[PDB]
Amino acid sequence: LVEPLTPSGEAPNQALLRILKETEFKKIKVLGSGAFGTVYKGLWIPEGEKVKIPVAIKELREATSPKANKEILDEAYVMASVDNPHVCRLLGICLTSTVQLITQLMPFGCLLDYVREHKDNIGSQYLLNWCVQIAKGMNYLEDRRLVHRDLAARNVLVKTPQHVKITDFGLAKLLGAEEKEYHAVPIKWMALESILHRIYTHQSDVWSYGVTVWELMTFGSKPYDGIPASEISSILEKGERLPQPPICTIDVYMIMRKCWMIDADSRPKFRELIIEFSKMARDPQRYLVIQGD
Amino acid sequence: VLARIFKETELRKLKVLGSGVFGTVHKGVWIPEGESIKIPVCIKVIEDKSGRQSFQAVTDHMLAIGSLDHAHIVRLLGLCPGSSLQLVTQYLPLGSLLDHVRQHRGALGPQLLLNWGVQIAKGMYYLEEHGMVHRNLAARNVLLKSPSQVQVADFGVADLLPPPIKWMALESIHFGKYTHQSDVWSYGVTVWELMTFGAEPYAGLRLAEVPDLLEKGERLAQPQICTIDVYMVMVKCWMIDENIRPTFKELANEFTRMARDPPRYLVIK
Numbered sequence: 001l002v003e004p005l006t007p008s009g010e011a012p013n014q015a016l017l018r019i020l021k022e023t024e025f026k027k028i029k030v031l032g033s034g035a036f037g038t039v040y041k042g043l044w045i046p047e048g049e050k051v052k053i054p055v056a057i058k059e060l061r062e063a064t065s066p067k068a069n070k071e072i073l074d075e076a077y078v079m080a081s082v083d084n085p086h087v088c089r090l091l092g093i094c095l096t097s098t099v100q101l102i103t104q105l106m107p108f109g110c111l112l113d114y115v116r117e118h119k120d121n122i123g124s125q126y127l128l129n130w131c132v133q134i135a136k137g138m139n140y141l142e143d144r145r146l147v148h149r150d151l152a153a154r155n156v157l158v159k160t161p162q163h164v165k166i167t168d169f170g171l172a173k174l175l176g177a178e179e180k181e182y183h184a185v186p187i188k189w190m191a192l193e194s195i196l197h198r199i200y201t202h203q204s205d206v207w208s209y210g211v212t213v214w215e216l217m218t219f220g221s222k223p224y225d226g227i228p229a230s231e232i233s234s235i236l237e238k239g240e241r242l243p244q245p246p247i248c249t250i251d252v253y254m255i256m257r258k259c260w261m262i263d264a265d266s267r268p269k270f271r272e273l274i275i276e277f278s279k280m281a282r283d284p285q286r287y288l289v290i291q292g293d
Numbered sequence: 294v295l296a297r298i299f300k301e302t303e304l305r306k307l308k309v310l311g312s313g314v315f316g317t318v319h320k321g322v323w324i325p326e327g328e329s330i331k332i333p334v335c336i337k338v339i340e341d342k343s344g345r346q347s348f349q350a351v352t353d354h355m356l357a358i359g360s361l362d363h364a365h366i367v368r369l370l371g372l373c374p375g376s377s378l379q380l381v382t383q384y385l386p387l388g389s390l391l392d393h394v395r396q397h398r399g400a401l402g403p404q405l406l407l408n409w410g411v412q413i414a415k416g417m418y419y420l421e422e423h424g425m426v427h428r429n430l431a432a433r434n435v436l437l438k439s440p441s442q443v444q445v446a447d448f449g450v451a452d453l454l455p456p457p458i459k460w461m462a463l464e465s466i467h468f469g470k471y472t473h474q475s476d477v478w479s480y481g482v483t484v485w486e487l488m489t490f491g492a493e494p495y496a497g498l499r500l501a502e503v504p505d506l507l508e509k510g511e512r513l514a515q516p517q518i519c520t521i522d523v524y525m526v527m528v529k530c531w532m533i534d535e536n537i538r539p540t541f542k543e544l545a546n547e548f549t550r551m552a553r554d555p556p557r558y559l560v561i562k
């Protein structure tokens with residue numbers, strides 16, 4: 001007759017995946033390149049609607065396998081599902097020989113590049129606000145039960161110096177109400193359990209968060225440089241973590257140390273991080289020593 | 294499994310039911326040898342455009358079509374050779390799935406829509422495992438056996454004639470290449486028809502180059518009752534690269550998983 005009711009309840013994902021044609025958007029120049037494909041800058045011109053939308057066009061090499069394709073499609077799924085001021089949302093995809101994700105352009109682009117180029121124009125109150133906004137975005141991602149398995153300065157975009165967002169989602173996985181862990185990658189940003197047991201959680205993205213904030217406070221320095229990804233494991237086993245950035249106080253670096261604790265439940269939550277860094281943001285010269293200010 | 298062969302005297306055509314791209318379907322009757330019984334059947338007449346006078350004898354392809362039976366495909370009762378080919382099947386009064394979903398629309402259960410997806414994928418999987426290519430899958434070619442059962446019809450009919458644009462894959466349009474994966478494309482369009490309650494694919498557009506647009510990156514828009522989860526499947530069915538497209542078993546399995554929790558994947562009020 002018909003096959004089992006077996007209900008789980010839960011809300012349906014009614015995210016709209018608008019499909020665009022290649023002739024509706026133009027390519028201007030390259031923003032990124034690699035084996036993943038190519039990220040372009042361009043102008044989106046909608047059908048009948050005419051506001052001209054500066055967009056990033058992430059176009060990827062055609063799929064090797066039947067679902068080599070759909071991790072790309074899962075990325076599109078996630079980028080279409082999320083809705084947040086601090087998370088970059090999909091505006092649509094172009095389905096052809098190569099799949100093209102389309103997002104809104106961020107003029108200043110990568111944050112990792114930004115904290116490098118503008119090394120001595122960045123103040124207290126910008127870094128702290130960036131940390132706050134990232135915490136908020138990641139907290140939204142936590143509320144949607146999806147884990148950002150690749151949080152770093154590389155994957156944070158800059159709309160304006162006062163506004164940043166989160167992206168990639170290429171490794172992001174959605175947790176069911178069932179699951180509490182995800183068991184399956186950048187070693188120097190992952191938590192210890194992600195390296196040893198391949199376990200990914202929301203508290204893993206907290207470790208990644210700590211490393212991100214570390215990249216920001218060190219103005220775009222490379223984590224554990226000189227140390228091969230080869231068994232960075234062991235150094236953590238010793239209990240050695242990332243050094244304290246020159247501009248950080250003992251309280252900020254305490255939060256950084258807090259995100260890198262072995263016990264996942266001992267680590268802070270994104271809500272907590274929002275509260276703390278928003279607290280610090282009301283008197284930034286007290287928590288960060290910068291002589292430019 | 295077994296192909297039955299009819300004599301022209303065993304068949305009779307009563308009323309024209311309709312004509313499509315390939316043949317003309319008559320509601321007719323079966324009067325076997327020596328009997329006086331009239332058994333209601335469906336006789337589809339295909340005109341021999343071979344030139345070699347090829348429908349006077351039972352070919353291998355005819356045997357291939359007649360040697361198929363499944364719970365979710367329309368079994369071919371018999372065939373009748375001659376100047377014109379006559380394909381005899383059961384007469385399903387409930388009509389096509391297209392006219393049905395257009396008729397009841399939202400009133401039908403989402404469970405039924407998903408399960409129908411599963412059934413169509415079932416029949417297509419059976420057809421594929423026996424090397425049978427459909428070449429004309431659509432909502433119009435899906436008939437209701439039961440109010441809960443649907444069956445795939447008009448399979449193998451296309452390659453009876455010498456060498457539907459809105460249900461065909463790109464390679465089929467450009468190069469006349471027909472594969473099981475083209476049947477996957479056609480399946481995706483069929484499900485689009487199903488869940489949009491009988492909407493016309495590419496309505497505002499004209500045929501002249503629906504293919505252009507498909508190559509430009511456009512597909513059929515997301516159905517108003519469809520979650521992103523269900524629309525993603527149709528999307529993958531409409532992929533240009535042939536072995537990126539899903540297989541019919543994967544399709545059946547995922548529509549089964551969705552059939553396990555209908556309101557989570559279809560929103561009708």
Ligand SMILES: Nc1ncnc2c1ncn2[C@@H]1O[C@H](COP(=O)(O)OP(=O)(O)NP(=O)(O)O)[C@@H](O)[C@H]1O
Pocket residue numbers: 310311312313314315316317318335337367382383384385386388389429433434436446447457
């Ligand atoms: N077994 C059947 N029982 C009842 N009606 C049938 C049956 N098979 C076909 N029909 C009807 O036949 C009519 C026209 O037949 P036909 O032209 O071969 O199909 P079609 O709807 O035109 N699709 P197609 O020809 O493959 O493009 C349709 O209205 C069908 O509902």
Ligand SMILES: Nc1ncnc2c1ncn2[C@@H]1O[C@H](COP(=O)(O)OP(=O)(O)O)[C@@H](O)[C@H]1O
Pocket residue numbers: 031032034036039055056058088103104105106107108109110154155157167168169170
């Ligand atoms: N919307 C955007 N605006 C500006 N730059 C972007 C945008 N999307 C991607 N980029 C560029 O691409 C990089 C991020 O791409 P990402 O989504 O992380 O893909 P991947 O990590 O798979 O290469 C950043 O360095 C950024 O400069």
Ligand SMILES: [Mg+2]
Pocket residue numbers: 154155168
């Ligand atoms: Mg990245």
Ligand SMILES: [Mg+2]
Pocket residue numbers: 313433434446447
């Ligand atoms: Mg028909």
